[PDB]
Design a binder for this molecule. Structure first.
Ligand code: NI
Lengths: 152, 149
């Protein structure tokens, strides 16, 4: 089935009144406008998004909703570097340097914490800068992603 | 005359005690390690820096000092976009978006203020973000630069 428009997000209804089949995406598949997936129940779906969310698909976004059946997005955990800045100047340096690598970056719970996909040169850069960090398996949800508005 | 290393900075002495000649550099000339300049008084100086400061030569860095004579660096003011963030989350967005254009970026006075060289695309990006900014002439001193490793 072709999906051209999102039908809202599970946060806006009660998932218990529907049958929800999830499709599992990686963080790096969330901004593809044309893609093919297979749901957990084995349904082939093709996204061909006409007005895709700026940040990418997010956890719980609804691809299909008909009678009581729903297909929704689930984002897979991946290996992520959690960054704990200790000052505004550190946040500015961390975010300038990860921007110059064009690596993905996501807001954490505090405005001093960020998450970025594990990449060896990103860990090397944070080590070289003495920035506190740890590598954990977690979800990079697109709602928290920093955009790149005018890429070179 | 060839200069291989800096002697210090005018901030650490009384400039009135010396005869100070300056070499005028633009901001985008400060990271040069090999170059030839003429001072405001007309002296020829060639730099050949063996261990250049990582962020660039800064205002007041001393190239030469002998007796009461000094040659120091002056960084020319240039047209800059002054940015005023309203939150640490905005500082993170501004600094990531500017880093993704590889534009230069410097700390301002407050921890929410930054400066970047005026570029038409950078202004368009900040307008798109709704970031408070103004265009004016200012000095981009290398000691305040954010650099890339
Ligand atoms: Ni690039």
């Amino acid at each position: 089935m072709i999906i051209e428009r999102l039908v809202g997000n599970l946060r806006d209804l009660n998932p218990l009144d529907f049958s929800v089949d999830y499709v599992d995406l990686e963080w790096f598949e969330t901004r593809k406008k044309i893609a093919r997936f297979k749901t957990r129940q084995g349904k082939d779906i093709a996204i061909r998004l006409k007005d895709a969310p700026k940040l990418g698909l997010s956890q719980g976004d609804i691809l299909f909703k008909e009678e009581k059946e729903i297909i929704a997005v689930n984002i897979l955990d991946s290996e992520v570097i959690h960054i704990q800045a200790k000052s505004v100047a550190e946040v500015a340096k961390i975010c300038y340097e990860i921007g110059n690598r064009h690596a993905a970056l996501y807001y954490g719970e505090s405005q001093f914490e960020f998450k970025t996909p594990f990449e060896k040169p990103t860990l090397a850069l944070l080590e070289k800068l003495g920035v506190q960090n740890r590598v954990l398996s977690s979800k990079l949800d697109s709602k928290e992603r920093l955009t790149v508005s005018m890429p070179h």
